[PDB]
């Protein structure tokens, strides 16, 4: 029952079975490397990946910096035996952790079942292995055997934290996306992880720790395993399908590369960035590719290069693709079994669902970009357990994701140099001097990943304007509700945990297996250092003004952004002028503790203010200082912000106003069926049901647009407010500490100040503020949805209803002969149904108790 049923040490002797030197497909001539078979069809190679790609043999930083927020290099990592032993144990521990969850047990079983298809012949009737889905296993006597395998975990390439799933290609076959599948090579390290900021959780967890949290490497590995799952079943989305962004405006990222395959794999809100028209195209496409496999098995009359029988191999693929087989031996794809399998691989196996099973803190979206790299070590039980990861039960790390908090659990996280420099990739944003005064421009650099995600309109497609023929055939969809924990359990119960495919004997391949990694689209660098001359101070200027670097002078707060940007000893605050005065005053040692007491009260009071309002649709609270914290709406003052918000609604928050384009909806054409009452009536019922679906389709589309175009904007402001609050705490702490350090050693001894206590209390206050800010911003996001996007859908939908009503009434009259005895009842039904809107229910489209309880 454990996934890894053997203890593996790097220096264990080879046995040619599960501990051996192996060779993998290669462009040139690789030497054998020591590897471990930790489970049927899965090997681990504790080596840096200098093998799989011949253009990637050097382990040093590259000439051109990778265009990624966090990268890390160390040519000496994983070069010693002890590191390789620790690497191996880390990976096996992580597999056990994944396997210990119902969801991971199901994913790993799917991976073992997902043998690459035997499509290596070009003969129409022959089953044959593809050799790049194999390895050579050297035996203790120095001979070798060849074996099929599904999955290899290997150490990273030069960028130690670039984790990804690689595989060898085919001259004609695109194995990862044509339904065949291919052996997957994951570059992965258990020895490092990412740090991310998170503030969404403060309401459920008000004592959430300060600073960065670490991603649990189990989540990270599970993410790569999910890609490996798609690719083994040949249903990966082509990497030329990317979510393209606008990059022209000053506030927009210079560039961003996020694949559809990535959005899918993340799940949650991110996967909903992809509209139904594209979703359904994919699903129909993979369905047809599975049908071709079934067909190819029906045409197969022989098998070569193994003693395994044709019956055995056909059966392996029956099970892999969950094909149906009739009593005559003929394979087919059942639509319902396919939809289940495809839904499990693409919607059940997601990062977001793994996070739910691990009960860990994790980024909620790919747009919550990693901010740091940490050295970790998960092998010792005192650091990390298979059931609890870092959050060890019955310790202070059990609650509030404390185990993942890199400041609280600092013995487990060593922060490394990020080799992406802070302004390696940036835009230069300059307030024209004359705006401030002729005086010099106020120009600041802004890190690429601090800018706004603005998705290209090309990403959102629909066929809403497309007419539709309605027939007596109901052609009516089922509900298809969102992946619940109960649904997952029901997949779990179905699941085949019985009989993995066997390790069969195949004939020996050549000593060097020739292979080239799958051809990838080339990616153009995005431009860098682009300069914008602006006629206003931006949120980026307001935020930068709140920062300070290393120095000797006493920092002073100022209510002037301009003063702060110009003087490294001056820091902008949106707090009151009384706070400025109180925090900046020379304070004698006898009044120090009273002064800190007051500042913490004032800091809390200022950051906890909430105004209530009845004058805004779907917004019942306002946090006024967001106005001057970030120059929202370019009004410098809170009164200006509260009023502006009442006057214009949630739109004043946005850096850009989305297009939400809903065309005239395609009209329904009804097939007539003279001489048949039941079919004519069915056609009227079908019209009305499809009209109900039409409202649902428009709403679902609008939500996708809103999630991607609007909610993302609000999320970033939410993150900048947390940064702004942190900046105020750090500045206030630096000033208080400077004052303390002016005192004599007698006064300090008497006072016995603990700056850690102050940090804690301020962090507590920041959490309380963020509870209010998150609730507020949530309201704004949903209000904007409710009041500025959805009504465009509603108007078009009511237009459609009105037209349909006329169509259906004409149809009843034109068929009143046939309908004789049924004309009046159908009139009422048509009239009733089409006289009232189908209410928008947000809960129907998005699952997040955060955005839903606003509704």
């Amino acid at each position: 029952m454990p996934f890894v049923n053997k203890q593996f040490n790097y220096k264990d002797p080879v046995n040619g079975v599960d501990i051996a030197y192996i060779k993998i497909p290669n462009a040139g001539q690789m030497q054998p490397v020591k590897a471990f078979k930790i489970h049927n069809k899965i090997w681990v190679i504790p080596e840096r990946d200098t093998f799989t790609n011949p253009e990637e043999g050097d382990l040093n930083p590259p000439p051109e910096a990778k265009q990624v927020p966090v990268s890390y290099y160390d040519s000496t990592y994983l070069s010693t035996d002890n590191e390789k032993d620790n690497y191996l144990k880390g990976v096996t521990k992580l597999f056990e952790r994944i396997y210990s969850t119902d969801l991971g047990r199901m994913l790993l079983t799917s991976i073992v079942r997902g043998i690459p298809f035997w499509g290596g012949s070009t003969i129409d009737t022959e089953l044959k292995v593809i050799d790049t889905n194999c390895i050579n296993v050297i035996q203790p006597d120095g001979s070798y055997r060849s074996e099929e395998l599904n999955l290899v975990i290997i150490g990273p390439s030069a960028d130690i934290i670039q984790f990804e799933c690689k595989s060898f290609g085919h001259e004609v076959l695109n194995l990862t996306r044509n339904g065949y599948g291919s052996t997957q090579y994951i570059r992965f390290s258990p020895d490092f992880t990412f740090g991310f900021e998170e503030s969404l959780e403060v309401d459920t967890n008000p004592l959430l720790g300060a600073g960065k949290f670490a991603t649990d490497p189990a989540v990270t590995l599970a993410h790569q395993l999910i890609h490996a799952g798609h690719r083994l079943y040949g249903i990966a989305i082509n990497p030329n399908r990317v979510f393209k962004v606008n990059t022209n405006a000053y506030y927009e990222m210079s560039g961003l590369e996020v694949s559809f395959e990535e959005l899918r794999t993340f799940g949650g809100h991110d996967a909903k960035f992809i509209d139904s028209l594209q979703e359904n195209e994919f699903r129909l496409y993979y369905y047809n590719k599975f049908k071709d496999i079934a067909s190819t098995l029906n045409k197969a009359k022989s098998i070569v290069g193994t003693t395994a029988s044709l019956q055995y191999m056909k059966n392996v693929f029956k099970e892999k693709y969950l094909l149906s087989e009739d009593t005559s031996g003929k394979f087919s794809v059942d639509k319902l079994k396919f939809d289940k399998l495809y839904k499990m691989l693409t919607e059940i196996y997601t990062e977001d669902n793994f996070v739910k099973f691990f009960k860990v803190l994790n980024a909620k979206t790919f747009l919550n970009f990693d901010k740091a790299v940490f050295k970790i070590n998960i092998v010792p039980k005192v650091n990390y357990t298979i059931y609890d990861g870092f959050n060890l039960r019955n310790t202070n790390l059990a609650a509030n994701f404390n185990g993942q908090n890199t400041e609280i659990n600092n013995m487990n996280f060593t922060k490394l140099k990020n080799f992406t420099g802070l302004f390696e990739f940036y835009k230069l944003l300059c307030v024209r001097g004359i705006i401030t005064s002729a005086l010099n421009d106020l120009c600041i650099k802004v890190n690429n990943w601090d800018l706004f995600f603005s998705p290209s309109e090309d990403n959102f497609t629909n066929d809403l304007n497309k007419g539709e023929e309605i027939t007596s055939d109901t052609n009516i969809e089922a509900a298809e509700e969102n992946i619940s924990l109960d649904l997952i359990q029901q997949y779990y119960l179905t699941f085949n945990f019985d009989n993995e495919p066997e390790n069969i004997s195949i004939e020996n391949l050549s000593s060097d297996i020739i292979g080239q990694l799958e051809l990838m689209p080339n990616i153009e660098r995005f431009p860098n250092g682009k300069k914008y001359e602006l006629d206003k101070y931006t949120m980026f200027h307001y935020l930068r003004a709140q920062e300070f670097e290393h120095g000797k002078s006493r920092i002073a707060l100022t209510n002037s952004v301009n003063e702060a940007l110009l003087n490294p000893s001056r820091v902008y605050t949106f707090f009151s002028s009384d706070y400025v005065k109180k925090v900046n005053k020379a304070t004698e040692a006898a009044m120090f503790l009273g002064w800190v007491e007051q500042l913490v009260y004032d800091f809390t009071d200022e950051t906890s203010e909430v105004s209530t309002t009845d004058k805004i649709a779907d917004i019942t609270i306002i946090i006024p200082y967001i106005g001057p914290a970030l120059n929202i709406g370019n009004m410098l003052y809170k009164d200006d912000f509260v009023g502006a918000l009442i006057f214009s609604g949630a739109v004043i928050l946005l850096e850009f106003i989305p297009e939400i384009a809903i065309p005239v909806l395609g009209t329904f054409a009804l097939v007539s069926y003279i001489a048949n009452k039941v079919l004519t009536v069915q056609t009227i019922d079908n019209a009305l049901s499809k009209r109900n679906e039409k409202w649902d389709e428009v709403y679902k589309y609008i939500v996708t647009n809103w999630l991607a175009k609007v909610n993302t904007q609000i999320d970033l402001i939410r993150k900048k407010m947390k940064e702004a609050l942190e900046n105020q705490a750090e500045a206030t702490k630096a000033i208080i500490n400077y004052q303390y350090n002016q005192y004599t050693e007698e006064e300090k001894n008497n006072i016995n100040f603990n700056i850690d206590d102050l940090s804690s209390k301020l962090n507590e206050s920041i959490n309380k503020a963020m509870i209010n800010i998150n609730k507020f911003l949530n309201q704004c996001s949903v209000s904007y949805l409710m009041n500025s996007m959805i009504p465009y859908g509603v108007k078009r939908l009511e237009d459609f209803d009105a037209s349909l009503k006329d169509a259906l009434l004409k149809y009843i009259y034109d068929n009143r002969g046939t309908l004789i005895g049924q004309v009046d009842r159908l009139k009422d039904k048509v009239n009733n149904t089409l006289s009232t809107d189908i209410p928008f229910q947000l809960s129907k489209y998005v699952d997040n108790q955060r955005l839903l309880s606003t509704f």
Partner: nanobody, 124 residues
Framework: QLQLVESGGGLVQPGGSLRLSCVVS????????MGWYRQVPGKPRELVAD???????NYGGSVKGRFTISRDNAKNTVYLQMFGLKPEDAGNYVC??????????????????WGKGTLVTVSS
């Protein structure tokens, strides 16, 4: 489920001696890998010494012969005899009951047993 109660901690002077003991409530005490771990606030537990079901002992790199771990199966007790105490030895001394399960230990899963500890303080 096992309860573990440590005793013997207190304030010790640098160079001084201590004898820690832990009594375990339960059964098949002699089934377990018994250990002593040191923990300071804001830090992970750290192995000081442990002893196999067969009496085989293992010690942290800082011990260097100064301490001795021992077990008495008829009394369900583990002992840690400590000499030449240093300021680095200060901490909560927590007894651990662990055992093998397949390729892993119960500790690795996270399901093993830990006492509240007995505090060791080293004076200036």
């Amino acid at each position: 489920q096992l309860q573990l109660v440590e005793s013997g901690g207190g304030l010790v002077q640098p160079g001084g001696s201590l004898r820690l003991s832990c009594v375990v409530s339960g059964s098949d005490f002699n089934t377990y890998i018994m250990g002593w771990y040191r923990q300071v606030p804001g830090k992970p537990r750290e192995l000081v010494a442990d002893i196999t079901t067969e009496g085989k002992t293992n010690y942290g790199g800082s011990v260097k012969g100064r301490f001795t771990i021992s077990r008495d199966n008829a009394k369900n007790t583990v002992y840690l005899q400590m000499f030449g105490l240093k300021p680095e030895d200060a901490g909560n001394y927590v007894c651990n009951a662990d055992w093998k399960m397949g390729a892993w230990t119960a500790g690795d899963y996270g399901i093993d047993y830990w006492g509240k500890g007995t505090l060791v303080t080293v004076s200036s």
